[PDB]
């Protein structure tokens, strides 16, 4: 019961930043140039970049879930 509450509490502040993280990923992956589309390597680099930029905010929220779970 406590774990889900703190997650909702975390979504109050961390969720807004997570919403910003999702906003940036969609905006970048939608706005592509002619040079970026025709290069396979550049697509994978942005795929890794969007992947890693997601991890940091997601890890913080899940850590906020883990820390309250032990306590």
């Amino acid at each position: 019961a406590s774990v889900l509450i703190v997650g909702a509490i975390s979504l109050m502040w961390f969720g807004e930043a997570l919403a910003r993280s999702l906003f940036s990923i969609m905006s970048r992956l939608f706005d592509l140039q002619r040079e970026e589309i025709f290069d396979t390597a550049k697509l994978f680099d942005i795929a890794l970049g969007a992947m890693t930029d997601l991890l940091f905010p997601l890890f913080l929220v899940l850590a906020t879930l883990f820390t309250a779970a032990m306590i």
């Binding site: 774990v3 890794l48 992947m51 890693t52 991890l55 890890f59 899940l62 850590a63 879930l65 883990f66 779970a69 032990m70």
Partner: protein, 89 residues
């Protein structure tokens, strides 16, 4: 083709999928035991704390073995093309 060619092809994919999945789930499995013995030491019966360490290590495995896995499958796609004339011979 021949029944033996199918088994050769079937095993190679089965060996490939086994290697592809094992590299990622091995680190998560070990971390699960490490969290399990930690919860055995403190006698805490919570079962949701272990999700985060497995998820973090799983992404770490994907980042470390991402190029190797993609290259292995890409070369596997080329390998079937190379052996395609042999089957159709």
């Amino acid at each position: 083709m021949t029944p033996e060619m199918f088994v050769e092809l079937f095993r190679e994919a089965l060996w490939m999928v086994l290697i592809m999945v094992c590299a990622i789930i091995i680190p998560s499995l070990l971390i699960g035991l490490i969290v399990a013995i930690f919860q055995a030491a403190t006698s805490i019966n919570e079962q949701t704390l272990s999700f985060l360490p497995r998820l973090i290590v799983t992404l770490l495995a994907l980042m470390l073995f991402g190029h190797w896995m993609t290259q292995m499958l890409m070369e596997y796609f080329y390998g079937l093309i190379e052996r395609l004339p042999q089957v159709l011979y």
